[PDB]
Amino acid sequence: VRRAAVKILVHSLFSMLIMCTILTNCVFMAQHDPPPWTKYVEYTFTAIYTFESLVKILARGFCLHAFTFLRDPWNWLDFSVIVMAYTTEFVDGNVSALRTFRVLRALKTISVISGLKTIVGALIQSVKKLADVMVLTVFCLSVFALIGLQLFMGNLRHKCVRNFTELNGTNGSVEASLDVYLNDPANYLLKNGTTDVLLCGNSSDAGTCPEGYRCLKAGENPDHGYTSFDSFAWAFLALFRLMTQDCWERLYQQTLRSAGKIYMIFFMLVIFLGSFYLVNLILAVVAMAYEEQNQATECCPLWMSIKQKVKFVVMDPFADLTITMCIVLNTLFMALEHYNMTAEFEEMLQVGNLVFTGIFTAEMTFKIIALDPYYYFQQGWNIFDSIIVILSLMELGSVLRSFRLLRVFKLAKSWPTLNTLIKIIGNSVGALGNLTLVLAIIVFIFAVVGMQLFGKNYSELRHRISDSGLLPRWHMMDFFHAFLIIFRILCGEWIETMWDCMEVSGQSLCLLVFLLVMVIGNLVVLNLFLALLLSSFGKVWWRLRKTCYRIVEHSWFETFIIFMILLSSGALAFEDIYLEERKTIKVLLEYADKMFTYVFVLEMLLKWVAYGFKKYFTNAWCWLDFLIVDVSLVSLVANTLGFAEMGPIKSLRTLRALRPLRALSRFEGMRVVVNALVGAIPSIMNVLLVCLIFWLIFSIMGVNLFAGKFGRCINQTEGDLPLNYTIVNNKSECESFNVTGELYWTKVKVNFDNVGAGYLALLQVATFKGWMDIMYAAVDSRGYEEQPQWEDNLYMYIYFVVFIIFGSFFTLNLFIGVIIDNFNQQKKKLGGQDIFMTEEQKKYYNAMKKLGSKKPQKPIPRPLNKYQGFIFDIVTKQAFDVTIMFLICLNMVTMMVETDDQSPEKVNILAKINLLFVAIFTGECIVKMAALRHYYFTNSWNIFDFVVVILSIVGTVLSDIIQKYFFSPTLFRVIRLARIGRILRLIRGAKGIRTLLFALMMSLPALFNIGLLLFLVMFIYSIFGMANFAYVKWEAGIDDMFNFQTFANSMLCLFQITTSAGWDGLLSPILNTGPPYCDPNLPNSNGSRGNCGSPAVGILFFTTYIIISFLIVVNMYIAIILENFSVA
Amino acid sequence: VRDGYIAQPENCVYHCFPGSSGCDTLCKEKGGTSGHCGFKVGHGLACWCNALPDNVGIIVEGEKCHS
Ligand SMILES: *[C@@H]1O[C@H](CO)[C@@H](O[C@@H]2O[C@H](CO)[C@@H](O[C@@H]3O[C@H](CO)[C@@H](O)[C@H](O)[C@@H]3O)[C@H](O)[C@H]2NC(C)=O)[C@H](O)[C@H]1NC(C)=O
Ligand SMILES: *[C@@H]1O[C@H](CO)[C@@H](O[C@@H]2O[C@H](CO)[C@@H](O)[C@H](O)[C@H]2NC(C)=O)[C@H](O)[C@H]1NC(C)=O
Ligand SMILES: *[C@@H]1O[C@H](CO)[C@@H](O[C@@H]2O[C@H](CO)[C@@H](O)[C@H](O)[C@H]2NC(C)=O)[C@H](O)[C@H]1NC(C)=O
């Protein structure tokens, strides 16, 4: 029987039997609320699994041999599942968590498929690569969590609570003490237009409660209780959130609303260093790991005559160009679809549709009968063409016509980049097919794990997870919705559903599973991304001329014009909505503007007479300056000689905001960075066209599926979708009930009603900032003009799933692929070695590299004293500094174990330990100064310890005083934590982290230049919006503090947008033009009337900014990763 | 009289000096007779005096240092 066991084990039939077994068990696990009909299918499954385990044991056929075939790491899984099944079969006791363990079988797929186990094994190694960088990032996250803790400890608890504590409540229990001030959230103030407590602050920057509401700290808890910055656990959670950018704009707005606008500095340090740089180096170490991994490997005459006739037809096909143009025209034709087509236009569209079906049928028949039917049986391209023909034919006798768009893809033959996107989509299920399969298995496992662990809780505790009593739009009861939750988490939106699951299930289990799916799923998604990437690869005339040449070549003149453009930029920045408030500066800046026009046109004439129209106009930045001065001169001459205040008066002067653009011509950093940017426009453009066509496909599909199905008819009394089944069924129905004008049939802001609005919705979905209301109104949609039913058409979520996949994971993949291609090409063509560094920045790069030499000086001289020699010999052992670092880590932990309103005795003990620690550090400092003599001047970590010792001794005294009108004065003790870098240098084990941080130091200047250009862009666009978007109605993303009404507010909004965050929330109040949201005439502090935004210029502004900032930050990432590859 | 370190208006600490002669005069000014150095944890060095009536204050803890 031993030989039989062996010969059936090596046999391949029972392996596929096991495969089908696992897969059917999968289809049964993914089933929720199964009938008792199934209670024996699980018995059969246990029988088959136990049979397989038997076969294995017999196949080895001994005691130590059976120990060898259970020595395998995977077979432990089969043993565990069979014993757990026997457990739940034999005896009860019942905790309902053992029934969850059935998901462990789905992992057996990894063991039965050939490369699956190998893929997962090679993936585990990536975690062994990520160990040191994970230590590094948890170190930084903890440091920044301490910073944000001391900064906003119990600050998010601030609430705009109605004023209280009136008079003699015996003692203070008078409200008409803490009992009411806490149980009175109805007496808190909720942010208008939302359901969210309104924060506030002492400082003279933060939110401003209206009359009848005062600022306090008597807040029950944060939004759900999981965002507070006190209790360093919660602060570590919040900063992991800020590092993954998940809903980070929300925490940003809340904090700035509570503490004060100055702390945008903290948030921008976190975003531009924690989020940006740390996420980049995580990605870079994963990419270096995977790079190393990839490196690891009827009659004869009539028959012959008609054959020669069809051959004479064949010799002149001349169709590829004509057929291609017919394809392009067919797409262009279907694109002319929209929401309200008149009946004759629909008839014309359908006529052209039938015409093109006929054309392609003619082509198919001519091709199969003319060249060879067997060749068109062979060549896969023509195979899929004929498939499209058959599909169109089935259509002509919804999704029926949605197959026509596949015809677009044959343009790939003439379009090498669309063919590269095709290569990528093919490799997705090709060389990376088993990796995609790992991903699918993981998403399945996690969906069913979450559904088992959380479905009963989701269904029973619905009341506390949804306001209008119904299901939540995201849950894990079904398997489709659990797949959707796992998808969301894969896209980066997990905190907003983790809050739900923790409010339903509980902190511990939900936190565990959601952090696990975040880490593992994002890891495998990153691995798939990176794998796809790496797989896709008289005399007075000349006298005056000489004088003017000396002037223009005079350094003082250049610095003068620099000062002048900076002053002009400031003058721009002084253009808020408060100029009517201050009449003097109005005229001051008027004179200033005239002076600017004069000096810049004078510089223009001077450069003219110095260099001449030819050698002047041969350059570009001078052309730019010429354009700007021309705009200013047109403005001036139109302001002087009337004929203004009717045409492009202000509507034309707002181009003044282009004034800062003179900076880039002169600052040596902006100029080289823009030279790197424009030098890749010929490579961003073709790829933007590929993405435009590939999103044209999806937008036409969305016009087919959704056009007209987005209008929702809400009454003015409420504010959201009227009855699903009844009340106002159709648009033609809601108008029948408008007998009172309370009801409006309004489309959703961003919809599918054209190819343009389709492009807008596709961008909002592909950036994942706004795709929530898109998907909601799209799946809710049932009829062409009928009210959307709360969850009908549920499987249209698959549209956005397949879009997000192709139009984002693959289009962005093409983006980054071609960007890497173009930049690796630029690296060789560039005269220098690496871009983004000026000559002086290059010099500083070389000098910092010469500094970063690991060769120290001589060890130490001898003090020649007996006692001093003893102290030196005891002070200069490695173990001493180990004790010192243990002390500083204990101080760190002492600074982790405090919260707000902790305990008075606790504050006393903590202060005592603070003094005790500064005493220990003064002691080690004086002992190192008495080591021999030279601690004061030998090493840099020693002088760092010295200066922090001095500052700590200074600390407590002014720390008493500067708690207010300043941040927490104990914050300065966090600097002591920086000393762990010394032992990080003096250890031997963890060494890649050293090179990582040094590469950050190397990439700091490039990031400086790029962020300087980004600051300039934020500046230009903030002035653009302060001219344009001022007075816009305050709505979803544009608050009473995040605004365009000033320059501070505009810089705030611009910064939050810079990371793509919340830009849907800023756009959505721009677009709304008309009632009931908007109004007619309005008395503004400025002549411009209308609290609306121009949809044209609004979409232009926001989309162009999204794309420009996207390219800029991708070049930031590029500099970072090219340095990380140089140090590789 | 109340015994303790002398605050700084309003709710703060005063400051000591390397000698018992620094703040003796300060106790004389607010109504203090004795004088020597003192230490308030969390707020820092002050100067301790006695025989201070309730018309003047001492180091009161809990709110903040505000002047
Ligand atoms: C904004 O600034 C004002 C002015 O300093 C703060 O007013 C004071 O705040 C405290 C709490 O921080 C209020 O409560 C007091 O607490 C102590 C200790 O429990 C108690 O002995 C007092 O009788 C009182 O209950 C205090 O009443 C309040 N001052 C007044 C005149 O009402 C305010 O707290 C600051 N808000 C924030 C959010 O920081
Ligand atoms: C839009 O919805 C209305 C509301 O049902 C439908 O029009 C008719 O409405 C009456 C009102 O009860 C029904 O009795 C009829 O059965 C409806 N017509 C049909 C054909 O069923 C119809 O679905 C839509 N009408 C229009 C004009 O679009
Ligand atoms: C129901 O009636 C109201 C008013 O009778 C309509 O509101 C008007 O909507 C148009 C749409 O552009 C505006 O131009 C008008 O200014 C609005 N009038 C107001 C606000 O008094 C409303 O559109 C109607 N709804 C439907 C579905 O027909």
Side-chain angles (χ1 to χ4, degrees), chain A residues 1-18 20-55 57-64 66-68 70-83 85-161 163 165-174 176-219 221-276 278-287 289-346 348-363 365-366 368-405 407-431 433-463 465-470 472-557 559-579 581-594 596-614 616-629 631-638 640-642 644-648 650-713 715 717 719-722 724 726-732 734-826 828 831-853 856 859 861-927 929-931 933-934 936 938-963 965-1038 1040-1080 1082-1088 1090-1124 1126-1128, chain B:
Chain A
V1 307
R2 191 167 71 198
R3 301 90 189 164
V6 175
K7 73 159 151 284
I8 193 47
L9 200 66
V10 186
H11 187 39
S12 303
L13 163 58
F14 177 80
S15 96
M16 300 222 187
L17 188 147
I18 292 321
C20 262
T21 318
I22 311 172
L23 265 65
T24 325
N25 192 31
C26 279
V27 193
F28 272 102
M29 288 185 299
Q31 188 48 236
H32 60 285
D33 198 338
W37 177 83
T38 77
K39 300 271 261 204
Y40 313 122
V41 202
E42 54 209 358
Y43 284 129
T44 75
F45 279 127
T46 72
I48 304 156
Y49 300 150
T50 40
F51 167 79
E52 203 276 284
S53 47
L54 279 184
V55 184
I57 311 154
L58 325 164
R60 296 286 293 172
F62 296 97
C63 318
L64 199 134
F67 194 74
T68 301
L70 210 79
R71 221 176 312 243
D72 165 77
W74 307 98
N75 289 337
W76 297 353
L77 168 84
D78 324 289
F79 179 66
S80 32
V81 53
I82 61 150
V83 306
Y86 279 162
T87 298
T88 178
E89 169 181 10
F90 156 67
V91 82
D92 202 6
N94 222 336
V95 311
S96 305
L98 72 170
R99 302 135 151 170
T100 281
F101 269 93
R102 284 177 182 155
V103 186
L104 277 55
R105 323 167 188 218
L107 209 168
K108 285 181 59 179
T109 327
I110 301 192
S111 45
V112 59
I113 313 294
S114 84
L116 252 292
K117 53 184 183 306
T118 84
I119 284 290
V120 168
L123 175 137
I124 282 291
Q125 305 320 283
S126 97
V127 157
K128 286 192 58 188
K129 264 81 181 179
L130 290 211
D132 47 297
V133 56
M134 257 295 161
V135 188
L136 209 180
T137 171
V138 61
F139 175 41
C140 312
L141 277 153
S142 36
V143 161
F144 275 97
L146 298 187
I147 292 178
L149 168 62
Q150 280 126 8
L151 265 163
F152 323 95
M153 292 177 72
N155 289 337
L156 275 66
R157 302 262 313 278
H158 294 7
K159 307 215 174 318
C160 278
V161 56
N163 41 8
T165 326
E166 306 155 342
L167 167 69
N168 280 330
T170 78
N171 40 324
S173 44
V174 46
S177 273
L178 170 144
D179 45 6
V180 192
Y181 321 140
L182 207 159
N183 274 357
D184 254 337
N187 275 86
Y188 298 166
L189 199 43
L190 44 91
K191 171 130 77 155
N192 64 34
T194 319
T195 188
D196 201 334
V197 279
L198 181 45
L199 317 195
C200 61
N202 296 132
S203 165
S204 280
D205 259 346
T208 48
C209 295
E211 86 295 326
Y213 299 95
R214 65 182 306 178
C215 194
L216 271 173
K217 208 245 202 176
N221 63 347
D223 61 10
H224 265 311
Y226 312 119
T227 53
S228 64
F229 296 160
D230 53 78
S231 49
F232 164 90
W234 290 144
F236 194 93
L237 176 73
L239 295 174
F240 182 61
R241 166 184 179 183
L242 284 205
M243 199 257 301
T244 54
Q245 311 220 13
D246 180 11
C247 206
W248 85 263
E249 71 281 5
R250 185 164 173 72
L251 188 147
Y252 174 89
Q253 298 199 349
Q254 285 172 324
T255 303
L256 297 212
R257 175 78 112 181
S258 84
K261 303 187 201 183
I262 294 169
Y263 297 114
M264 176 178 73
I265 306 159
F266 168 52
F267 274 113
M268 107 173 301
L269 304 191
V270 162
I271 289 296
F272 271 78
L273 212 63
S275 168
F276 277 15
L278 260 173
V279 163
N280 281 25
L281 269 293
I282 291 282
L283 266 57
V285 56
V286 186
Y290 178 62
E291 176 47 60
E292 193 279 331
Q293 295 181 349
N294 192 31
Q295 182 266 290
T297 297
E298 302 275 90
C299 40
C300 166
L302 262 306
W303 260 13
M304 307 302 88
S305 47
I306 65 173
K307 281 168 193 291
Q308 200 54 38
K309 201 172 188 177
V310 310
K311 289 315 182 299
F312 283 173
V313 158
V314 156
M315 60 205 184
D316 204 322
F318 177 80
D320 46 320
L321 270 299
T322 75
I323 289 276
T324 279
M325 274 274 129
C326 300
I327 294 173
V328 183
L329 260 302
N330 192 355
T331 78
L332 295 174
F333 204 78
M334 292 177 72
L336 317 173
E337 191 171 344
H338 60 285
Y339 163 43
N340 236 357
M341 332 176 65
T342 174
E344 50 268 11
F345 198 55
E346 322 167 18
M348 173 189 313
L349 257 293
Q350 209 29 70
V351 158
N353 269 335
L354 267 44
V355 159
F356 278 95
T357 70
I359 301 171
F360 286 98
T361 49
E363 169 46 41
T365 70
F366 286 11
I368 53 185
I369 76 185
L371 300 85
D372 168 37
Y374 324 136
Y375 283 165
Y376 288 84
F377 177 80
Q378 173 53 46
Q379 198 40 50
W381 205 255
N382 317 79
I383 285 282
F384 271 99
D385 311 337
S386 317
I387 301 166
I388 312 305
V389 188
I390 311 164
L391 264 73
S392 63
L393 266 290
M394 212 286 257
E395 175 227 317
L396 49 89
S398 66
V399 199
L400 330 161
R401 69 180 75 171
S402 314
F403 315 111
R404 289 171 176 150
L405 309 149
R407 259 173 310 202
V408 171
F409 286 98
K410 292 189 292 185
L411 308 161
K413 303 315 289 169
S414 43
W415 203 350
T417 301
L418 192 46
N419 198 277
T420 300
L421 184 142
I422 282 317
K423 288 174 45 183
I424 273 314
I425 300 189
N427 192 31
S428 154
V429 296
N434 49 358
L435 177 63
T436 320
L437 196 39
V438 155
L439 177 63
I441 290 161
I442 286 178
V443 182
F444 170 80
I445 289 169
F446 273 122
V448 298
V449 155
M451 78 178 307
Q452 301 302 344
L453 294 181
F454 303 117
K456 300 181 37 73
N457 289 337
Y458 263 119
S459 160
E460 295 149 11
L461 296 117
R462 264 152 37 180
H463 73 300
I465 208 186
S466 311
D467 41 12
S468 159
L470 281 84
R473 319 288 306 222
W474 302 79
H475 49 220
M476 308 189 104
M477 29 186 73
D478 306 26
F479 168 86
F480 191 44
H481 300 291
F483 170 63
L484 288 186
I485 286 274
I486 305 308
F487 198 54
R488 222 190 171 192
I489 294 175
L490 288 201
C491 308
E493 317 225 350
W494 43 274
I495 207 88
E496 31 209 5
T497 176
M498 190 217 280
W499 293 340
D500 266 348
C501 183
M502 294 188 335
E503 199 59 22
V504 149
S505 326
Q507 268 86 321
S508 35
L509 190 51
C510 187
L511 177 63
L512 159 83
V513 52
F514 275 66
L515 257 302
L516 268 191
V517 54
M518 176 65 181
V519 175
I520 306 297
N522 289 272
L523 181 90
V524 292
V525 169
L526 256 299
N527 192 31
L528 178 59
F529 200 109
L530 276 49
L532 264 38
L533 268 175
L534 275 315
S535 178
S536 155
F537 284 12
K539 177 57 185 64
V540 81
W541 194 265
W542 293 301
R543 162 167 278 248
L544 175 57
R545 179 220 43 77
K546 177 51 180 93
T547 62
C548 271
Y549 180 98
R550 179 186 298 173
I551 309 165
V552 59
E553 296 288 328
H554 212 296
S555 87
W556 291 137
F557 180 45
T559 41
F560 163 68
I561 218 66
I562 291 261
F563 210 80
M564 285 312 319
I565 187 54
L566 267 285
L567 261 286
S568 64
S569 283
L572 288 170
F574 284 102
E575 276 137 21
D576 67 347
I577 49 155
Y578 294 136
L579 275 197
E581 253 197 350
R582 280 220 164 110
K583 305 305 207 67
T584 59
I585 36 172
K586 294 185 47 55
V587 199
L588 313 174
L589 276 313
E590 293 230 31
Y591 289 165
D593 189 316
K594 294 182 190 293
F596 299 135
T597 55
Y598 290 159
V599 54
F600 282 112
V601 71
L602 173 148
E603 184 280 300
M604 200 202 54
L605 313 173
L606 195 151
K607 189 80 58 60
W608 267 353
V609 313
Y611 288 70
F613 281 59
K614 277 167 156 289
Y616 162 87
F617 279 114
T618 187
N619 243 326
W621 291 268
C622 51
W623 253 100
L624 161 64
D625 189 1
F626 171 43
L627 265 291
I628 319 184
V629 293
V631 187
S632 46
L633 296 154
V634 186
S635 68
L636 177 50
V637 307
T640 44
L641 322 161
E645 318 310 351
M646 193 130 249
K650 38 199 157 52
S651 301
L652 177 63
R653 189 187 74 227
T654 65
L655 311 163
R656 228 167 46 193
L658 299 150
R659 221 191 271 166
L661 277 151
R662 298 183 238 247
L664 315 109
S665 35
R666 305 189 264 255
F667 297 88
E668 292 134 359
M670 287 181 182
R671 175 172 59 84
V672 291
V673 172
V674 150
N675 288 328
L677 258 186
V678 168
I681 271 280
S683 316
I684 306 146
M685 275 319 304
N686 43 354
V687 167
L688 184 51
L689 281 179
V690 185
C691 302
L692 274 157
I693 304 315
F694 201 77
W695 297 22
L696 171 134
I697 286 182
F698 286 102
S699 34
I700 299 164
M701 208 176 319
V703 186
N704 289 337
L705 291 147
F706 310 117
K709 311 208 163 208
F710 276 45
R712 48 184 28 64
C713 289
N715 42 357
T717 290
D720 221 18
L721 297 59
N724 327 330
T726 49
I727 313 307
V728 289
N729 192 31
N730 257 323
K731 156 147 118 192
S732 325
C734 63
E735 57 93 1
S736 170
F737 300 105
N738 209 18
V739 315
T740 84
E742 194 91 358
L743 295 174
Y744 302 70
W745 196 91
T746 59
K747 322 196 242 168
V748 310
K749 279 60 179 180
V750 177
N751 44 28
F752 292 83
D753 274 342
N754 289 284
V755 189
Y759 265 108
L760 192 60
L762 289 209
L763 190 63
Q764 281 206 355
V765 163
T767 60
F768 309 118
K769 271 87 196 188
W771 58 273
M772 297 296 180
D773 208 352
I774 303 290
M775 299 167 92
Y776 292 179
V779 308
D780 287 22
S781 74
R782 179 83 96 83
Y784 181 84
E785 300 240 19
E786 86 150 11
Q787 278 272 5
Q789 277 76 15
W790 193 84
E791 183 178 2
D792 288 21
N793 219 5
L794 162 57
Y795 292 77
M796 294 300 293
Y797 270 102
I798 303 159
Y799 174 40
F800 303 106
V801 171
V802 180
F803 174 33
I804 277 142
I805 295 155
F806 288 111
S808 296
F809 184 74
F810 292 122
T811 59
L812 263 64
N813 207 322
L814 183 64
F815 253 111
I816 318 298
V818 175
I819 282 184
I820 298 314
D821 189 328
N822 195 86
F823 284 28
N824 226 22
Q825 260 197 359
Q826 283 191 3
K828 197 146 254 193
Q833 295 308 331
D834 290 318
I835 185 64
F836 300 123
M837 287 321 189
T838 299
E839 184 213 84
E840 293 177 350
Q841 306 272 358
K842 215 125 228 184
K843 288 287 178 184
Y844 285 17
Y845 190 105
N846 312 138
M848 263 199 51
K849 183 132 195 174
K850 299 302 138 292
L851 295 174
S853 189
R862 217 44 178 71
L864 318 173
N865 205 343
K866 294 225 82 193
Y867 279 164
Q868 210 175 19
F870 288 149
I871 311 162
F872 177 80
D873 198 359
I874 202 150
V875 175
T876 317
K877 196 161 95 159
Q878 42 90 31
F880 167 61
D881 287 286
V882 174
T883 70
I884 300 314
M885 68 179 216
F886 200 20
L887 316 180
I888 196 50
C889 307
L890 290 163
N891 192 31
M892 184 185 200
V893 179
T894 327
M895 259 183 313
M896 304 179 166
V897 296
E898 73 285 54
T899 91
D900 69 324
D901 77 320
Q902 27 195 338
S903 284
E905 51 267 41
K906 196 177 165 185
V907 196
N908 186 340
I909 304 148
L910 262 295
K912 291 174 65 175
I913 309 189
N914 154 48
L915 303 180
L916 200 169
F917 262 102
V918 62
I920 309 149
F921 294 138
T922 47
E924 50 176 52
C925 159
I926 60 196
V927 166
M929 282 193 296
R933 214 205 66 195
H934 292 161
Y936 70 100
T938 317
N939 301 311
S940 195
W941 307 132
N942 299 65
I943 74 157
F944 182 37
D945 177 275
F946 177 80
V947 51
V948 298
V949 157
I950 312 294
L951 200 39
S952 40
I953 303 304
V954 189
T956 90
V957 202
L958 76 169
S959 196
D960 156 84
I961 331 169
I962 60 172
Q963 192 109 6
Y965 57 82
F966 217 58
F967 59 88
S968 285
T970 175
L971 203 165
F972 311 104
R973 269 210 308 277
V974 188
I975 290 115
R976 297 215 294 259
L977 268 300
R979 208 176 188 274
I980 316 161
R982 194 207 184 287
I983 194 44
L984 212 182
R985 170 164 297 282
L986 267 293
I987 56 150
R988 53 158 162 92
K991 205 56 186 172
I993 160 175
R994 190 254 176 187
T995 84
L996 197 144
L997 261 191
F998 183 62
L1000 159 70
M1001 312 284 189
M1002 269 305 149
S1003 302
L1004 276 156
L1007 295 174
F1008 161 65
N1009 291 354
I1010 309 264
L1012 185 83
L1013 167 53
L1014 180 63
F1015 148 74
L1016 169 63
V1017 171
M1018 304 173 50
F1019 188 44
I1020 300 178
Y1021 275 89
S1022 34
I1023 305 158
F1024 265 144
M1026 190 167 27
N1028 283 309
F1029 308 140
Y1031 295 93
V1032 152
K1033 188 186 181 173
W1034 280 339
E1035 272 275 303
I1038 283 201
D1040 63 71
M1041 161 169 324
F1042 289 75
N1043 258 313
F1044 290 98
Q1045 280 181 350
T1046 88
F1047 177 73
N1049 289 337
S1050 280
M1051 215 55 176
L1052 293 179
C1053 297
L1054 268 279
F1055 163 55
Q1056 109 176 18
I1057 276 195
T1058 312
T1059 53
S1060 275
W1063 81 261
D1064 73 81
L1066 258 53
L1067 191 38
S1068 313
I1070 293 326
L1071 305 182
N1072 43 19
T1073 62
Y1077 295 91
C1078 263
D1079 297 82
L1082 182 56
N1084 297 351
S1085 300
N1086 187 7
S1088 69
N1091 76 326
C1092 319
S1094 150
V1097 82
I1099 298 164
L1100 175 56
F1101 182 99
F1102 280 98
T1103 49
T1104 37
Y1105 186 33
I1106 289 326
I1107 299 155
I1108 280 194
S1109 59
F1110 179 95
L1111 301 162
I1112 292 171
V1113 308
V1114 182
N1115 289 337
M1116 259 181 223
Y1117 300 4
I1118 284 322
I1120 288 176
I1121 62 100
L1122 63 84
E1123 226 295 306
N1124 289 337
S1126 156
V1127 65
Chain B
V1 307
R2 58 182 53 250
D3 201 0
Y5 320 104
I6 296 91
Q8 249 182 5
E10 225 288 309
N11 188 335
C12 290
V13 297
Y14 203 62
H15 298 89
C16 190
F17 288 104
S20 92
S21 159
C23 286
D24 187 0
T25 59
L26 177 63
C27 295
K28 290 180 175 58
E29 84 188 357
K30 311 292 187 293
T33 40
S34 96
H36 69 70
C37 208
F39 221 106
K40 169 53 170 46
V41 73
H43 286 241
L45 296 87
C47 55
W48 170 283
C49 304
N50 199 356
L52 310 154
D54 201 14
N55 73 319
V56 74
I58 57 174
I59 166 62
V60 302
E61 100 281 6
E63 156 62 29
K64 210 36 79 196
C65 177
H66 70 306
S67 278

